[PDB]
Symmetry: none
Subunit: 201 residues, 10 copies
């Protein structure tokens, strides 16, 4: 005998473990917040000071074009949105299937949404290692300090200087560390959740 703003969140909380909520909090507070708030200003001047010894117009632009095909800030943001998408689609799924059964009607009668959470965590584990592999094969571990440029709309080889490398290396090391921690915690979620459901058998 509860209102449906009542038996609508227990059907949400009971199907998710506290480790999952902790994962959500860590990946929204230290992962979704640092990138927009600190990564946005640092990478604005990646264009302004790609300064290096040439004089004919149009060498520096092609030098940076061959230098940075894809900035890793966009990589981080797309990785973040894809690693947050399934938690939203599952949220919509569970709210949709919880708000519908109460309309028909009949010490609670909480439904058991266990089949989708394990496949959810499987998709989580699969969607992190691959993007980590792409990060490792594309951007490495530490950013270069200088770059030789040879594709000529300009005469000769131009030795061209990046702007502010140490900040970038430290910040991306921090992102690597937090991503590694999240990966292990996510692996812990599934391996604990599967055991805590066959124990009833």
């Amino acid at each position: 005998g509860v209102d449906l703003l009542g038996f609508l969140i227990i059907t949400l909380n009971c199907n998710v473990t506290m480790v999952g909520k902790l994962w959500f909090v860590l990946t929204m507070l230290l992962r979704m917040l640092v990138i927009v708030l600190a990564g946005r200003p640092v990478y604005q001047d990646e264009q302004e000071r790609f300064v290096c010894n040439t004089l004919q117009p149009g060498c520096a632009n092609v030098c940076y074009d061959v230098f940075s095909p894809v900035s890793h800030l966009r990589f981080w943001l797309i990785q973040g949105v894809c690693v947050l998408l399934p938690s939203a689609v599952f949220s919509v799924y569970v709210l949709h299937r919880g708000a519908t059964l109460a309309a028909l009607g009949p010490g609670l009668q909480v439904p058991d949404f266990s089949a989708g959470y394990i496949i959810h965590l499987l998709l989580r584990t699969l969607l992190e290692a691959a993007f980590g592999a792409l990060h490792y094969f594309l951007f490495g571990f530490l950013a270069p300090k200088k770059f030789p440029c040879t594709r000529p709309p300009c005469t000769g080889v131009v030795d061209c200087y990046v702007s502010r490398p140490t900040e970038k290396s430290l910040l991306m090391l921090f992102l690597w560390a937090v991503s590694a921690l999240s990966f292990l915690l996510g692996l812990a979620d599934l391996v604990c959740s599967l055991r805590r459901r066959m124990r009833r058998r």
Copy 2:
């Protein structure tokens, strides 16, 4: 016997299919979020480095003016707001017609708002293909790398260089792909919803 914060969301959820909620989630998380967050910084320096071989003041500005009449970032934002508007007007419609009947009063009595959802999806299908056609006829598929400029407040023809083309081409390809996916999913919504309502006949 439920509160009106009760029989106010089932009258919302029951008239919309889970495919529609999934559409909403995908077009707000991968479509409304990427554009503001990643498209805003990339296109700030479309003006700073339209660099090219001229010396008299006032050639580069007219060269860009003849180069880019309308930036496609504004096109994407206006397309996004117009493709999100009907879902808001229908939301207001259904809340208005659900919160009013409960005032008069008389195992639920959920109203059937099916006539408006099919015309809603018709408007959705009509409002996407046209803007896609304008995108195709105006901005093409890949951005040029260099541009010849001839309208003289300046002497001669000026070969003028864009800034950072590959990032733009990849990003707009991603937008094209997500828009194509959303179009097919939206076509699926109406064609399934119409069948699931004549089946009762």
Copy 3:
């Protein structure tokens, strides 16, 4: 016999017509959202490239000062905040007068807040035409392409070039069109609401 999170929104919805909610949605989604999101980036480089033929320092700054006394972006924002203020003051008024009567207590007993909505719409109609007249008398319809400058801290007359005019003209035409549509819809609201209240007599 409803909770006071119950008989608190019907006393809000019943005193406002669906045309009013549609007005609110259109003026927050296509009017409050486009200006902050697309008008902010376009007008950052109104200062950087006011480029024109002079060499002594301090001519370009006074030339722009005599050029643009007030930027119309600030005009649009102040117009938006003033055209959204009365809907907030009325909202606070109606919530205050609805949450107070329920404390004393005694098939609903919804109060009739009709006197304030008609004067609300009168204030709406009065607060739009005047600012439209100021817009017409101050900023015209299309932005100039070049400007002659004569006030001397610099020698001679300087012919000075604006940056990116066509984008500005198209965007402000779009704002003019949406404002005109909102004006007519707002005029429709009052003229329909007054009739729908004397019909009971």
Copy 4:
């Protein structure tokens, strides 16, 4: 016999007058919104175009350093946060003391939080006049147009030009006017509230 999401807002609304809510609305809609949204873009180019007649590097920077010790945008923001802080601390106080008494339990029994609101308004009146006095003694009424610079890391006296003064003067006049209106309205709140409580005696 009401839920505690019930007797939790009347204990909030009944202890505050409609003039106070109107004050809150005016100081968040015309005061907190204009500053972030219009004051942020105008003052970005206060650094870019502090242009003036010198050639040795490092004169303009010290000239601006002696020119503007503290920008008044930061002054406005700190003033805004301090003039909004007490309304938040009182809000937390009243919610804390309202949500606690209902736990013990026993035509309502609304508590009377009148002692704190009068001291609240006293603190309000005291925290505005002082900062107004600092504003008057530090930033004056109208911004200069040109500035003489003498502290030498550079040779001679440099006559140095500000950027866009009239916009700044008009905007800060608008802030002065709205602050003056808020001050008088806040003085009205306390002087009316004290009378409306001794009238019961």
Copy 5:
């Protein structure tokens, strides 16, 4: 006999003291708001005007690289997120343990979450002094005005000028003061909370 949107916030408010809520308000209104809103614009031009007497390209960039290894804005943001993280993890913990017991069911029966709040405050006290020590040992109290640069990709020693130091010194003094106040208030919370729980013995 209350709804579970009822006995869900008293189980939140009763386990936290009003001093804690005041701490939350002060550290989100004067600490989380000033940094994003005033610290973001001031530190954008820390790169643009690191101006100083050299002519060969690539001396200024390495001079700033040896000048500022880590900007203290990022230090402040990471400190803020780490000093707000435990209050979020505890919030999730208490909501999770409060929303679960109500499902089973049986003048209230509020649980006593006192063990976690004291260890929470211990972690708070430990996570502030260390970062304060790092701040003191890394960034000092006042920012320099000029800097000698010697690491050669450039010929000689370059005396290089910072931009806008007094604003930075005053602002970081304000942050130091508010952090010191928060530290003392947080120390007060634990020392009062421990006493107010052994008094029942």
Copy 6:
């Protein structure tokens, strides 16, 4: 049981709203008083100093005759008397119908004179806009400074000078403003009075 100098003014006050009395006060203190007291002396010397270059007698008189057909002072006075007439005729009506019923005789028995007040306000609203339109089409907004005169009892074209124009323009602007304020307030009276009488139904 009251004297008839008693139940003779409540039958007057009860049928008129406080907004109406405020209208009466504003239009007699700032409208009937300024015109007689300040407009009478200013316009005496509109004849004495219509001075201009001619020598044959009888050119200046015909020049002013073609210059000013009707002085706007008389227009203002006739407008004032016509906008005060209905309030006098209604006053006489209500006193006549109140002093007569008491002669016959039978916690008061105040009559309801509501039908005449609404038609009174209708006549008010109709009798202001028309005269405003005549004012706009006849006297414009600002008075000329000089006038060419051609109708010959005199030789040639005579350029003829008005006396004291700025005082006249400012004063008539003040009258325009007060008339505009009175118009809006009068429109408010009827629209509020009609609502406050159907609310009883």
Copy 7:
């Protein structure tokens, strides 16, 4: 059982019809007020600018003396005072005969003063047509523009110019119209009052 400030005005109002009060209001507000307030200033400069071609002193004065024997302003004022005199003498009569009977003393006992009101209206009708006839035979309908003067203290015939004729013609037309309206209304009063007294027979 009423005070004598009571049964002293009903004995005044009951013997006069509402048409009579309306006549009084119209002839004091549009007839007694316009003449003193607008007719006084216009006719001050009827003497100053009776300008015309002569040079020997003392021709213009005799020319005006033969021009205007009696100014029609004095005619209007004497007509007004004579058309207001009987209403005052009757007022004094009725107050005198009402305040005297109450001294002796004995659902009212209002006296019937009907014989004097009909003779009053007869005197009214007789005292208007005659003065209208004198106005028509003396001052005509429109004022001349120029006047020939022949009575010699001066040599020759002098063609002499009036000042401001159109204002005078329009104003006296307005007086003619209001007088005509008052005449018809006064004729209506008697013809209705005589019928409404023989109807009782």
Copy 8:
């Protein structure tokens, strides 16, 4: 048993005859009103156009000084105030002696103030004939048209012309007639009042 705003006017009306009230009305409506309203404007230009054949400065002023020692307008006003003074002093006397006896207290008990009214009328009759005699001996019956001037600050005899004589003669004839009528009516008052008081003997 009447209020003292009751037995305060019958003690005023009963001691004065209707002929006296008629005298008051005629001498305030046709005597006090014509002089201020029509005599004030006519006599303003008695100074401006005392025009006559002389050229040396200062002859015309002495010519008028010997012409008009005292203007008869001031004579009329002083005569009016002296002929209205006793009616005011008697009014104050009777109100003072009527408002005092009622304080002590005891089908009315009206006092008999007959002794003062007869001496009042005696003073009236005495204060009119003398001033009439002065008028006759000083100002005659008709005003001259021209005047010879001989007292030399100027050379010769100057024949000097008055302005507008016929208006003055007609107006002062009207005053003479009304004064003569008032004199006879006042003589009638006393001779009737004395008889109507010895008839009781």
Copy 9:
């Protein structure tokens, strides 16, 4: 047992003697009325005809400026307002103290306001002799007929003529006489009132 429009004027009349009322009547009818009505027109042409033998512009104006520093008309008006002010302040005092005691409530109970009337008459006697002394020392008894002028913006000594002196001398003699009569009567009031109050002892 009287109404409060009853025991409100006896408390006014009983505290003032008939000599005082006679003083009020004489000083308002022969003193306040003559000055506004006859002194206003006579002194308008004190400026127009200050005619005298000079030709260079700007001698006559300075000659009158040295002639009349202060016109005695303004002196008379300020003297009148100051000699009428205390009678108004005492009137307000006595009405205020009479209308207040009746609110509380308990062959009359008239209060005795004798202390203020004697000090009132003392202030009267003191405020007349001083202004009479200033009149005597400033304006003398008879006005000059001609004036020598020497302060040069003009060449030589100019013998300059006043306008209409005899009227002024006679009129100001009349004012002197009436003021002298009022002074003696006012001295009589106090000396009689003090005796008529110690006689009760």
Copy 10:
């Protein structure tokens, strides 16, 4: 048990202090009376004798136009009407709220209108200092004696003379003094009235 012409003025007198009535008397007798009666005649000839050395027609008029933009007589009158307006609006307010409660009915029951009088005096204090500041910044303390004129419709610089300056300076000094006295007395009213109402607490 009093008539309603009874309990209608005590509800007026009791809510206003004797200092307020004294203020009303002083500002209507020495402030409203001097300006109309003495300021009207003095400033009529501000136009007639603006005499100065020029001969071409149309120089003097423009010279005065640049001389006096706004005459301070109109400033004084508008200041007077605005400083008398609130006392009228409050009067109407209190009579309206006093005459209405008596209709319903139930050693008096006088209402307490204290809240409006303090805000009334606040508005009084605010509406005087500002207009005093405008007076000080616009018209100064003493009027000039001569004025140089340069705006050419006339040849050269014209030294132009005012008329009667010392009278103007003395009179406006008197107005300044009386305004200063009224300001201090009004400040006394509020500061005494606020104390005399918290003394009851």
